[PDB]
Amino acid sequence: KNKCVNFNFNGLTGTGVLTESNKKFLPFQQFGRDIADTTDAVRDPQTLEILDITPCSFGGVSVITPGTNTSNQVAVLYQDVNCTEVNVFQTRAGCLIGAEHVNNSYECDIPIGAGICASYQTSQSIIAYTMSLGAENSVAYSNNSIAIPTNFTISVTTEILP
Amino acid sequence: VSMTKTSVDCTMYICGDSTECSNLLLQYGSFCTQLNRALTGIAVEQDKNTQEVFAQVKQIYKTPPIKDFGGFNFSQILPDPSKSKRSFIEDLLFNKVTFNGLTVLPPLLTDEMIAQYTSALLAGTITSGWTFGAGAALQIPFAMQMAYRFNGIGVTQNVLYENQKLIANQFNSAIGKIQDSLSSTASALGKLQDVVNQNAQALNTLVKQLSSNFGAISSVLNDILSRLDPPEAEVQIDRLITGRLQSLQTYVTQQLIRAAEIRASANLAATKMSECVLGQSKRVDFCGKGYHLMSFPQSAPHGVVFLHVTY
Amino acid sequence: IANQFNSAIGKIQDSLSSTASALGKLQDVVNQNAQALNTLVKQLSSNFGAISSVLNDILSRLDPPEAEVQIDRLITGRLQSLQTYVTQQLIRAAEIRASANLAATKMSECVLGQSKRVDFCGKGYHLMSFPQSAPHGVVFLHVTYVPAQEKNFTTAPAICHDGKAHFPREGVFVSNGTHWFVTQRNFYEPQIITTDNTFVSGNCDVVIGIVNNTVYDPLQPELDS
Amino acid sequence: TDNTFVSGNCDVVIGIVNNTVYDPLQPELDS
């Protein structure tokens, strides 16, 4: 048990991890299913032990890669996993292997997920950090203070629409 | 604003790690890849429709400790930093909203980052007014900022100076009526629940198609190979592949049309968070019924809650 | 203005010549269309459950009661590929058509007039817009008004000449330390407080945080002179 | 005279009435 194995009982077969459960089964039942026809629970024939059918570590493989004329260092990032079943940092989308965690918050250049982004800092290396939502600024609010602009400039922006 | 990000693989959903099932997927060419690139493009557009509406100001402003804003009570809309900064209204907005290749991934802009984006729009409209949306953060008192909103709709500023205590009781009591309405009436948040009804209820119908026979003699790939001959089981397996890919061609079509409706709503949500919030909309009945003064946006799961101030 | 506006046009030309990342709104339309056209020809090489991908190879080799089964599986497999081709292109055409309704709005309101909408003519206060030609799109040149510097001055809602409250018509009342001046929120100018710039409304016993200042009446020196 | 403005005459407006405009310049001369 407790592995990514292929279970084959007298009434149910498939592939899943037999983890511990907290439900309450009936002595004449054999297994249990989910709402939309998904087997997620099994029962031993003559042993008081309730086990679930946990799916193994699966998901897409997303690789953060730089340009072909800039750098060659990449990182390994799997989806919907942890850092135990697989520069190691755990995120909500999966385990990020190949990036050192930095407490300093910088500008989000490459998105990863759950507020975590990566950048290329000096020689270039992939880092893991929480993205910055903007520059901190405390407005001097008062009842008898105002800021009237005296100098101006002319800036022309460009917006592209199909 | 956006929807729930869910990536469904074209391999693990059709074939349950079978060798003979994957041999027929190569005969279709790039039919497996076009279903994966279509579901991946929705998650890219969900991140684009989230950042273009919420992340509009490149500077995060904080609330000053001196809360002298003309006698108003902004404690119900300010997120508490001691608790995920959530206000008194946002506590009800989060609680009243509820295998084979199904990969659920969280988005980049989580709910903890929308509270800091709305805090810059809240402190920016009060302390700096409308100057931070066009240039630098120019400070201005809130008693004189509200007098300019009356001048845009043709109202003299003498009414604000003589009814300061009258506007402090009608506005602060109107916020509590919305908080009591969302807790009692559960049908008031049906728009946020409609995003779940188009994603979670649609995912429950997708797994039930795997148990369907689809005109074949069985619904399990292991039963057809073990019973029928290997030259004879390829006909009944191909009937299951043609039926299960039709379920994927229906789920991609029904979600991409609904993704265009959220993206069309994201263009309206970005307009109501810029024209109605950061400025003063001259459009009649755009911020709701009545003469629009200002608006304060709130965070919501896969959406946004508006609080328009009407006259 | 002539030194800042002419220099802002040159920064757009230097940005387009340095890299092509500024035109990403049009390159995504071509890349999603060119890859959709090239992948459709690759579906003809697929078997689609048949023994071959060529229509002439199945008919000239198999039996005429036997080749009709493999061709019909190949035709129905190609009709599902064309069904996805019509479905994926029509939803993408509806997004450009929804963008064309937004482009028709900006070319008729922002270009042909002055709009008072925030984040509709770029970032900043809108003055004018110049459209430019583009393949399967349009390029806008939104002229914006952004301030550079500022000064912190003491403000007041109104003043009190002889007990009555004088409210400003346009702008607020600031002071450099000694005298109160009239200015707007976008440009500083030491204007003298006259009767033509304010109006009498209410009294000086209701407004909280009011100050006292003598209003310069132009009717008084014209009579004694 | 500051809250209103003079435009045209009083012989072309349909449905016009007569009144008295309190000119603030008149008590200034008599002061």
Side-chain angles (χ1 to χ4, degrees):
Chain A
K1 60 179 298 180
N2 299 329
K3 285 299 179 60
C4 182
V5 285
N6 302 333
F7 67 99
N8 182 26
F9 289 153
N10 196 88
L12 187 60
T13 178
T15 295
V17 186
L18 302 180
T19 58
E20 300 180 0
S21 180
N22 299 325
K23 300 180 180 180
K24 296 180 180 180
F25 278 178
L26 300 178
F28 61 95
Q29 288 180 334
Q30 184 68 218
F31 59 93
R33 297 180 179 179
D34 213 0
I35 307 178
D37 196 70
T38 300
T39 63
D40 51 351
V42 285
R43 194 190 68 89
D44 299 1
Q46 290 189 2
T47 299
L48 301 179
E49 180 181 1
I50 298 178
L51 303 179
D52 293 334
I53 309 172
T54 305
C56 311
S57 300
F58 74 105
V61 180
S62 300
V63 178
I64 299 177
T65 162
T68 60
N69 302 330
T70 301
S71 180
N72 292 321
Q73 300 181 2
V74 293
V76 181
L77 175 65
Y78 298 146
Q79 298 177 0
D80 208 1
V81 299
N82 43 10
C83 296
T84 56
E85 299 178 0
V86 177
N87 300 330
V88 180
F89 183 74
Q90 182 180 1
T91 58
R92 297 299 180 180
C95 186
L96 181 58
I97 300 178
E100 184 179 0
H101 182 253
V102 179
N103 302 330
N104 300 330
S105 181
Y106 294 147
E107 189 180 0
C108 180
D109 192 64
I110 300 107
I112 297 178
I116 307 299
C117 303
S119 180
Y120 297 146
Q121 300 292 330
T122 300
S123 300
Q124 300 180 0
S125 180
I126 304 179
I127 59 178
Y129 61 96
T130 310
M131 61 178 183
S132 180
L133 304 182
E136 300 180 0
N137 184 27
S138 180
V139 184
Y141 179 76
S142 180
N143 300 330
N144 43 13
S145 180
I146 210 178
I148 301 299
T150 60
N151 188 23
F152 70 102
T153 180
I154 303 299
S155 301
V156 178
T157 60
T158 302
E159 189 179 0
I160 311 297
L161 291 92
Chain B
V1 172
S2 60
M3 296 182 302
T4 304
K5 178 182 300 180
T6 301
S7 180
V8 181
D9 197 9
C10 86
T11 305
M12 300 180 60
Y13 179 75
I14 304 301
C15 304
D17 300 330
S18 180
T19 308
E20 284 80 12
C21 182
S22 60
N23 301 331
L24 299 181
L25 299 182
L26 300 180
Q27 302 178 359
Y28 294 151
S30 60
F31 198 84
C32 222
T33 321
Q34 288 179 359
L35 294 179
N36 292 326
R37 292 177 181 179
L39 295 177
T40 316
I42 302 178
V44 178
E45 292 292 329
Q46 282 177 12
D47 300 330
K48 293 181 178 180
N49 292 330
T50 315
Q51 296 179 0
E52 288 290 331
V53 180
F54 293 150
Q56 299 180 1
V57 182
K58 301 179 181 180
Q59 295 181 359
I60 296 299
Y61 298 147
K62 299 181 180 180
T63 306
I66 305 299
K67 298 181 179 180
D68 191 12
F69 299 142
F72 294 150
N73 184 26
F74 294 149
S75 60
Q76 300 181 3
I77 58 180
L78 184 67
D80 194 19
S82 63
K83 300 184 300 180
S84 300
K85 303 181 180 180
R86 300 177 181 180
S87 64
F88 294 150
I89 313 178
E90 296 177 1
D91 293 330
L92 301 179
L93 297 170
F94 295 150
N95 301 330
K96 297 300 180 180
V97 177
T98 60
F99 188 77
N100 291 324
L102 284 87
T103 301
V104 180
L105 297 177
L108 175 64
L109 203 66
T110 57
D111 50 350
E112 299 181 0
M113 295 63 180
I114 317 176
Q116 300 186 12
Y117 278 150
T118 53
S119 300
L121 304 182
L122 183 127
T125 327
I126 295 173
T127 61
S128 66
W130 297 340
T131 60
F132 79 107
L138 311 179
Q139 58 270 2
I140 173 168
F142 192 74
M144 307 181 63
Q145 178 61 40
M146 293 291 300
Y148 188 74
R149 299 182 174 95
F150 291 150
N151 301 330
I153 55 178
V155 183
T156 330
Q157 56 182 353
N158 195 24
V159 199
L160 183 63
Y161 297 147
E162 71 180 0
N163 299 327
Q164 185 68 30
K165 300 180 180 180
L166 186 128
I167 208 178
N169 301 330
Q170 299 289 333
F171 179 73
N172 294 330
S173 300
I175 310 297
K177 298 179 180 180
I178 310 178
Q179 191 179 0
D180 298 330
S181 301
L182 298 181
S183 180
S184 300
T185 301
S187 62
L189 295 177
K191 299 300 179 180
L192 297 180
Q193 202 68 29
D194 189 70
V195 194
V196 195
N197 294 329
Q198 292 292 329
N199 186 84
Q201 300 179 358
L203 277 174
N204 296 330
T205 335
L206 190 63
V207 198
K208 295 179 180 180
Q209 302 295 139
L210 299 177
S211 59
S212 305
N213 300 330
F214 288 146
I217 209 178
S218 179
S219 60
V220 191
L221 304 176
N222 301 330
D223 298 335
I224 310 179
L225 186 63
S226 301
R227 293 176 58 181
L228 286 89
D229 299 332
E232 296 182 0
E234 299 181 0
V235 187
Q236 308 294 327
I237 284 177
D238 190 70
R239 293 180 179 270
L240 277 178
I241 300 178
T242 324
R244 285 176 180 180
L245 287 175
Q246 193 179 0
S247 302
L248 289 185
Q249 281 286 339
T250 315
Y251 182 75
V252 165
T253 309
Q254 285 181 0
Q255 283 290 333
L256 193 54
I257 300 171
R258 288 299 181 270
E261 301 180 1
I262 305 300
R263 189 179 178 178
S265 301
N267 302 330
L268 188 60
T271 313
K272 290 182 179 180
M273 285 188 60
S274 300
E275 184 185 356
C276 191
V277 171
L278 308 181
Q280 182 177 1
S281 180
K282 305 301 179 181
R283 299 163 63 176
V284 189
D285 299 330
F286 182 69
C287 307
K289 303 301 179 180
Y291 291 153
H292 154 247
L293 306 179
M294 59 180 180
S295 295
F296 292 145
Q298 295 291 332
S299 62
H302 305 282
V304 57
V305 177
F306 294 145
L307 296 178
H308 300 284
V309 181
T310 64
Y311 180 79
Chain C
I1 309 177
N3 295 330
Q4 297 291 331
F5 178 73
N6 298 330
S7 300
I9 311 297
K11 298 179 180 180
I12 310 178
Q13 191 179 1
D14 295 330
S15 300
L16 297 175
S17 60
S18 301
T19 178
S21 61
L23 300 180
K25 299 300 180 180
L26 291 181
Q27 293 180 359
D28 296 335
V29 191
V30 187
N31 290 330
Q32 285 180 0
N33 189 28
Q35 291 179 0
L37 260 62
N38 297 330
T39 327
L40 189 60
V41 200
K42 297 179 180 300
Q43 304 297 136
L44 298 177
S45 60
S46 303
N47 299 330
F48 289 150
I51 209 178
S52 180
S53 60
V54 191
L55 299 177
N56 302 330
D57 186 71
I58 310 178
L59 183 62
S60 60
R61 181 182 301 270
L62 281 84
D63 298 333
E66 295 182 359
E68 297 180 0
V69 189
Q70 308 294 326
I71 293 177
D72 185 70
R73 294 179 181 180
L74 185 55
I75 290 179
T76 322
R78 287 175 181 179
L79 287 178
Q80 296 180 0
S81 300
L82 285 185
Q83 184 65 35
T84 324
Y85 177 75
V86 175
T87 306
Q88 288 180 356
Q89 285 292 142
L90 191 54
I91 304 174
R92 289 175 180 177
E95 299 176 0
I96 308 298
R97 188 181 178 180
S99 180
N101 301 330
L102 187 60
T105 310
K106 296 182 179 181
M107 287 185 62
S108 60
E109 178 182 356
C110 190
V111 173
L112 301 181
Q114 181 182 6
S115 181
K116 304 178 182 300
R117 303 172 59 179
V118 196
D119 296 341
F120 192 76
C121 300
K123 301 296 181 179
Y125 291 152
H126 167 239
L127 296 176
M128 57 182 180
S129 297
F130 292 150
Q132 294 290 333
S133 300
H136 305 284
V138 74
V139 176
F140 290 153
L141 299 179
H142 293 287
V143 183
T144 61
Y145 179 78
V146 181
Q149 301 179 0
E150 51 94 10
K151 291 180 180 180
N152 300 329
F153 291 141
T154 304
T155 179
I159 56 181
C160 300
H161 176 61
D162 50 350
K164 299 182 299 299
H166 299 269
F167 293 148
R169 302 179 180 180
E170 296 179 1
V172 299
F173 291 155
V174 309
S175 180
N176 46 7
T178 306
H179 298 286
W180 297 88
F181 294 147
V182 185
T183 186
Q184 296 173 338
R185 294 174 176 86
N186 299 328
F187 186 76
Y188 179 72
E189 183 180 1
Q191 300 180 0
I192 312 296
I193 305 181
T194 59
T195 59
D196 300 330
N197 301 330
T198 182
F199 60 96
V200 180
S201 180
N203 42 8
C204 276
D205 299 328
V206 194
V207 183
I208 310 177
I210 211 170
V211 296
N212 304 331
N213 190 21
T214 300
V215 183
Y216 179 76
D217 192 16
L219 310 178
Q220 184 179 0
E222 295 290 331
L223 182 59
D224 301 330
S225 301
Chain D
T1 59
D2 301 330
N3 300 330
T4 53
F5 51 91
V6 182
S7 295
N9 42 12
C10 266
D11 300 328
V12 291
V13 182
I14 304 299
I16 210 170
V17 292
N18 302 331
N19 212 21
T20 300
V21 177
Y22 293 151
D23 189 23
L25 196 57
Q26 187 68 30
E28 186 70 29
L29 182 61
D30 301 330
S31 298

